Design an enzyme around this catalytic site. Structure first.
Site, PDB file in Angstrom:
ATOM      1  N   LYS A   7       0.826  -1.198   0.000  1.00  0.00           N
ATOM      2  CA  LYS A   7       0.000   0.000   0.000  1.00  0.00           C
ATOM      3  C   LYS A   7       0.866   1.256   0.000  1.00  0.00           C
ATOM      4  O   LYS A   7       0.587   2.175  -0.785  1.00  0.00           O
ATOM      5  CB  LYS A   7      -0.917  -0.038   1.219  1.00  0.00           C
ATOM      6  CG  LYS A   7      -1.794   1.182   1.395  1.00  0.00           C
ATOM      7  CD  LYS A   7      -2.749   0.907   2.536  1.00  0.00           C
ATOM      8  CE  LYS A   7      -3.528   2.156   2.890  1.00  0.00           C
ATOM      9  NZ  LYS A   7      -2.680   3.047   3.657  1.00  0.00           N
ATOM     10  N   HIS A  12       2.603   5.988  -2.752  1.00  0.00           N
ATOM     11  CA  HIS A  12       3.608   7.024  -2.678  1.00  0.00           C
ATOM     12  C   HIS A  12       4.770   6.920  -3.624  1.00  0.00           C
ATOM     13  O   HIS A  12       5.509   7.889  -3.780  1.00  0.00           O
ATOM     14  CB  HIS A  12       4.157   7.095  -1.239  1.00  0.00           C
ATOM     15  CG  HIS A  12       3.139   7.415  -0.155  1.00  0.00           C
ATOM     16  ND1 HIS A  12       2.438   8.530  -0.005  1.00  0.00           N
ATOM     17  CD2 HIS A  12       2.758   6.564   0.858  1.00  0.00           C
ATOM     18  CE1 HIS A  12       1.649   8.392   1.041  1.00  0.00           C
ATOM     19  NE2 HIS A  12       1.857   7.211   1.545  1.00  0.00           N
ATOM     20  N   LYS A  33      -9.163  11.930  -1.487  1.00  0.00           N
ATOM     21  CA  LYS A  33      -8.245  11.835  -0.375  1.00  0.00           C
ATOM     22  C   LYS A  33      -7.694  13.236  -0.191  1.00  0.00           C
ATOM     23  O   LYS A  33      -7.240  13.776  -1.190  1.00  0.00           O
ATOM     24  CB  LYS A  33      -7.161  10.858  -0.742  1.00  0.00           C
ATOM     25  CG  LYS A  33      -6.086  10.742   0.314  1.00  0.00           C
ATOM     26  CD  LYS A  33      -5.194   9.536   0.056  1.00  0.00           C
ATOM     27  CE  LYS A  33      -3.931   9.509   0.918  1.00  0.00           C
ATOM     28  NZ  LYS A  33      -4.204   9.393   2.339  1.00  0.00           N
ATOM     29  N   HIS A 111       4.484   3.858   6.304  1.00  0.00           N
ATOM     30  CA  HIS A 111       3.704   5.099   6.381  1.00  0.00           C
ATOM     31  C   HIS A 111       4.584   6.271   6.055  1.00  0.00           C
ATOM     32  O   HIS A 111       5.783   6.211   6.364  1.00  0.00           O
ATOM     33  CB  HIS A 111       3.126   5.359   7.767  1.00  0.00           C
ATOM     34  CG  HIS A 111       1.947   4.454   8.035  1.00  0.00           C
ATOM     35  ND1 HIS A 111       0.808   4.442   7.357  1.00  0.00           N
ATOM     36  CD2 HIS A 111       1.897   3.464   8.987  1.00  0.00           C
ATOM     37  CE1 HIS A 111       0.066   3.481   7.851  1.00  0.00           C
ATOM     38  NE2 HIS A 111       0.733   2.891   8.829  1.00  0.00           N
ATOM     39  N   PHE A 112       4.041   7.302   5.419  1.00  0.00           N
ATOM     40  CA  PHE A 112       4.760   8.515   5.095  1.00  0.00           C
ATOM     41  C   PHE A 112       4.411   9.469   6.219  1.00  0.00           C
ATOM     42  O   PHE A 112       3.271   9.896   6.393  1.00  0.00           O
ATOM     43  CB  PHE A 112       4.272   9.046   3.758  1.00  0.00           C
ATOM     44  CG  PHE A 112       5.216  10.057   3.162  1.00  0.00           C
ATOM     45  CD1 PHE A 112       6.250   9.606   2.359  1.00  0.00           C
ATOM     46  CD2 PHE A 112       5.047  11.399   3.448  1.00  0.00           C
ATOM     47  CE1 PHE A 112       7.130  10.533   1.860  1.00  0.00           C
ATOM     48  CE2 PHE A 112       5.936  12.326   2.943  1.00  0.00           C
ATOM     49  CZ  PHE A 112       6.977  11.884   2.150  1.00  0.00           C
ATOM     50  N   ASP A 113       5.380   9.820   7.039  1.00  0.00           N
ATOM     51  CA  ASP A 113       5.084  10.664   8.162  1.00  0.00           C
ATOM     52  C   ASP A 113       5.171  12.120   7.768  1.00  0.00           C
ATOM     53  O   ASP A 113       4.280  12.874   8.167  1.00  0.00           O
ATOM     54  CB  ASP A 113       6.046  10.360   9.287  1.00  0.00           C
ATOM     55  CG  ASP A 113       5.564  10.896  10.617  1.00  0.00           C
ATOM     56  OD1 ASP A 113       4.809  10.219  11.312  1.00  0.00           O
ATOM     57  OD2 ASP A 113       5.933  12.011  10.946  1.00  0.00           O
TER      58      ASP A 113
END
Length: 116
Positions: A7, A12, A33, A111-113
């Site tokens: 995902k 990304h 989104k 995850h993209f922080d």
């Protein structure tokens, strides 16, 4: 069905643009989104950030890592006027440090922080 790592890659990675790519990568086919960042670096170079500078995530957990260098990124931000089905995005290109949360074995971005 997708793993968290899969995902992250669909959402990304990418080794107007935002309306086209957000639809292509199944982010805006069934919702709009609000924000999404695409990274224009190789997948292996983004995966390499999970062994770079350890930092706290926005939420206080400590499995986040900041890239030593800046990377080419495109930020996609929904306009104030956007409403499903007609999602609309403001496209901003930038070269920024990325911060990703990593998990697993192999330890990979899930995850993209943030970018900095």
């Amino acid at each position: 069905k997708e793993t968290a790592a899969a995902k992250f890659e669909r959402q990304h990675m990418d080794s107007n643009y935002c309306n086209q790519m957000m639809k292509s990568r199944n982010l805006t086919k069934d919702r709009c989104k609000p924000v999404n960042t695409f990274v224009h670096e190789s997948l292996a170079d983004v995966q390499a950030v999970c062994s770079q500078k350890n930092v706290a995530c926005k939420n206080g957990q400590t499995n986040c890592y900041q890239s030593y260098s800046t990377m080419s990124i495109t930020d996609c931000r929904e306009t104030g006027s956007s409403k499903y089905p007609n999602c609309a995005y403001k496209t901003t290109q930038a070269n920024k440090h990325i911060i990703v949360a990593c998990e697993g074995n192999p330890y990979v971005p899930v995850h993209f922080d943030a970018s900095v």
